[PDB]
Amino acid sequence: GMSNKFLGTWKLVSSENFDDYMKALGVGLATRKLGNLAKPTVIISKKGDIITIRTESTAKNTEISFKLGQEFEETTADNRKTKSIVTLQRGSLNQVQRWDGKETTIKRKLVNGKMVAECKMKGVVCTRIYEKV
């Protein structure tokens, strides 16, 4: 299952191309400004087979809980209401969100003790790097 090394609190330390990823998602300028400045924490926890990923920032807080492989409804930081599924593939937590005939993917993997989130929307790619607090 998910490596226990995912568990704990992560702090954003670097990000590339997040503005364009937000643009692709239909996020407006005022909110993109927050997104490009914010350095959120991401808290990952688990109870039984339920994984929880909480994101905390002044910009916005979000929280999802899920079982691997099972679709759930999600409200995203930019207020999209999506049908989402997270699966584990070769160590990576692969989140797919679907809404309005659109889809985006966020893959989270552990690389060199960091958590690397790779986000893709119609060919626009960003990467966000987190360090463990």
Q: How far is the CB of 48 from ligand PLM (least distance, A)?
A: 23
- Interface with ligand PLM includes 44 (CB under 6 A)? no
Q: How far is the CB of 125 from ligand PLM (least distance, A)?
A: 12
Total residues contacting ligand PLM (rule CB under 6 A)?
Answer: 19
Q: Which stretch binds ligand PLM (CB under 6 A): 1-9, 37-45, 67-75, 84-92?
A: 37-45
What would the 3-class secondary structure string for the chain be? CCCHHHCEEEEEEEEECHHHHHHHHCCCHHHHHHHHHCCCEEEEEEECCEEEEEEECCCCCEEEEECCCCCEEEECCCCCEEEEEEEEECCEEEEEEEECCEEEEEEEEEECCEEEEEEEECCEEEEEEEEEC
Q: Which of 84, 77, 75, 6 is nearest to 35 (CA)?
A: 77
Report whether 98 belongs to an annotated binding site: no
Binding residues for ligand PLM restricted to 101-120, rule: CB under 6 A: 106, 117, 119
| Sequence ranges of the binding site for hexadecanoate | 108, 128-130
The binding site comprises 108, 128-130
By CB under 6 A, name the binding residues for ligand PLM. Answer: 22, 27, 31, 34-35, 38, 40, 42, 55, 57, 59-60, 76-78, 106, 117, 119, 128
